[PDB]
C-alpha cells in the first residue's frame, strides 16, 4: 500500500507537469490567436 501511494504521488506529479505543459501550450495558442487576428486586420488595411 505504501508503494502504491508512492506511485500515486509520482503519477499525480507527472499529471501536474503534463497539465502545466498543456496550459502553457494553451497560453501560447491564445497569444497566437491574438497575433492572427491583429495580423489579419493589418493584412486587410495594408491590402487596401
Amino acid at each position: 500500500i505504501r508503494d502504491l501511494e508512492a506511485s500515486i504521488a509520482r503519477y499525480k506529479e507527472e499529471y501536474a507537469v503534463l497539465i502545466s505543459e498543456a496550459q502553457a501550450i494553451k497560453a501560447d495558442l491564445a497569444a497566437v490567436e491574438a497575433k492572427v487576428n491583429r495580423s489579419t486586420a493589418l493584412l486587410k488595411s495594408l491590402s487596401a
Binding site: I1, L4, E5, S7, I8, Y11, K12, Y15
Partner: peptide, 11 residues
C-alpha cells in the same frame, strides 16, 4: 491513476 486507486482499494 483511477486503475491504481482501484487496485489499492482492492488490496
Amino acid at each position: 491513476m483511477v486503475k491504481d486507486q482501484q487496485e489499492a482499494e482492492k488490496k
